[PDB]
Structure 1
Amino acid sequence: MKTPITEAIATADNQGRFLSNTELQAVNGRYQRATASLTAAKALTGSAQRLITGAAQAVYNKFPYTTQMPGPAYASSAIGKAKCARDIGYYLRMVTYCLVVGGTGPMDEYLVAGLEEINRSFDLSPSWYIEALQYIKNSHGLSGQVANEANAYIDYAINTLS
């Protein structure tokens, strides 16, 4: 995963050099912004079941065909609505994994790479998940730079789908 630590290590064995002070400052700036990051990942984990079931309902209010179309790709079954709710469980879990390590490493490894090939093979529209993520982005209730860190990894998940 690409953290700010593991990219400072990565430029060192690029050249095969030792760890100088052109990489200690990269880890130093990570430790500054990790105190406004783990206060954000704590609050998203604490209100996770409020955010997930509120974001499934924001998709169903905007796209009411998905609750009533027959077929396997839609959440009109009992098992269609469970597969929808664990998908927004997966999108919130990779945001709090990315806030902990301080970079887009976990959602590059687990969400982003290979996403187009499974949304095309299983007929999942990528505008469903932007509406599930736009509900989270202005109703987590955070305030300040703790809000400014959650609105950079939710917005990174949107720009992959957008």
Structure 2
Amino acid sequence: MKTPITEAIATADNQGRFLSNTELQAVNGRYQRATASLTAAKALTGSAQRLITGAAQAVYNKFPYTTQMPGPAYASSAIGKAKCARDIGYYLRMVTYCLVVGGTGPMDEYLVAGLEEINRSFDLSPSWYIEALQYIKNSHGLSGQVANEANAYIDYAINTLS
């Protein structure tokens, strides 16, 4: 995963050099912004079941065909609505994994790479998940730079789908 630590290590064995002070400052700036990051990952984990079931309902209010179309790709079954709710469980879990390590490493490894090939093979529209993520982005209730860190990894998940 690409953290700010593991990219400072990565430029060192690029050249095969030792760890100088052109990489200690990269880890130093990570430790500054990790105190406004783990206060964000704590609050998203604590209100996770409020955010997930509120974001499934924001998709179903905007796209009411998905609750009533027959077929396997839609959440009109009992098992269609469970697969929808664990998908927004997966999109919130990779945001709090990315806030902990301080970079887009876990959602590059687990969400982003290979996403187009499974949304095309299983007929999942990528505008569903932007509406599930736009509900989270202005109703987590955070305030300040703790809000400014959650609105950079939710917005990174949107720009992959957008």
Q: Distance in 1 between matches of 2:40 and 2:90?
A: 17
Count of matched residue pairs = 162
Task: State the 1:112 CA deviation.
Answer: 0.0
Q: Distance in 2 between matches of 1:105 and 1:13?
A: 19
2:43 aligns to what SS in structure 1? helix
Task: State the 1:123 CA deviation.
Answer: 0.0
Task: State the 1:122 CA deviation.
Answer: 0.0
Identity within the alignment, %:
100
Task: State the 1:34 CA deviation.
Answer: 0.0
Task: State the 1:37 CA deviation.
Answer: 0.0
Q: Distance in 2 between matches of 1:77 and 1:142?
A: 34
Q: Cα RMSD between the aligned structures?
A: 0.0
Q: Deviations over 1:20-58 (max 9, x none)?
A: 000000000000000000000000000000000000000
2:148 is the counterpart of 1:148: yes
1:109 aligns to what SS in structure 2? helix
2:4 is the counterpart of 1:4: yes
Q: Distance in 1 between matches of 2:132 and 2:6?
A: 31
Q: Distance in 1 between matches of 2:49 and 2:88?
A: 10
Provide TM-score, normalisation by structure 2: 1.00
Q: Deviations over 1:64-118 (max 9, x none)?
A: 0000000000000000000000000000000000000000000000000000000
Gaps of 5+ in 2: none
Q: Distance in 1 between matches of 2:105 and 2:128?
A: 24
**Deviating runs (4+, > 3 A) in structure 1?**
none
Provide TM-score, normalisation by structure 1: 1.00
Task: State the 1:59 CA deviation.
Answer: 0.0
Q: Distance in 2 between matches of 1:107 and 1:78?
A: 28
Task: State the 1:11 CA deviation.
Answer: 0.0
Q: Distance in 2 between matches of 1:160 and 1:133?
A: 12
Equivalent residues in 2 for 1:130-145, closer than 5 Å: 130-145=130-145
Q: Distance in 1 between matches of 2:161 and 2:26?
A: 29
Q: Distance in 1 between matches of 2:62 and 2:68?
A: 13
Q: Distance in 1 between matches of 2:139 and 2:118?
A: 28
